Amino acid sequence: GIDAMNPSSRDDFTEFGKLLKDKITQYEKSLYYASFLEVLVRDVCISLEIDDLKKITNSLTVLCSEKQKQ
Amino acid sequence: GIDAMNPSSRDDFTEFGKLLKDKITQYEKSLYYASFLEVLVRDVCISLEIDDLKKITNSLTVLCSEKQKQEKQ
User: Fold this and answer.
1) Shortest CB distance from B59 goes to which of A8, A16, A38?
2) What superfamily in CATH does domain A1-70 come from?
């Protein structure tokens, strides 16, 4: 699925993200998962506009708040 | 070979990360890319505990501020 996929439409990206989610999150309990993600997340976000970058950080901060609430 | 990769070792995860980065960043200019990443980043981080989540958030907040600095300059 992932290697061959070539997304351009909105629905393609939704699918691309779902496959990527499914693949990556298999490894969520690996001792290396968090250090892996730290590298990957920054890497895939480096080209983003400051505004787009800020949306992602705010969402993770919301996520972090929900976790502190839980 | 992202789909077939089955990482275990730290180096496995380094290689897995590189493949993932190379594939995903091909689509950087898509008008859907930011939206796609907002969903993917949340999806991959949702199970993390707080301190893991904090390290990712800080790397992005530092990145943001460093992008601001360079534009300003």
Assistant:
1) A38
2) Eukaryotic translation initiation factor 3 like domains (1.10.246.60)
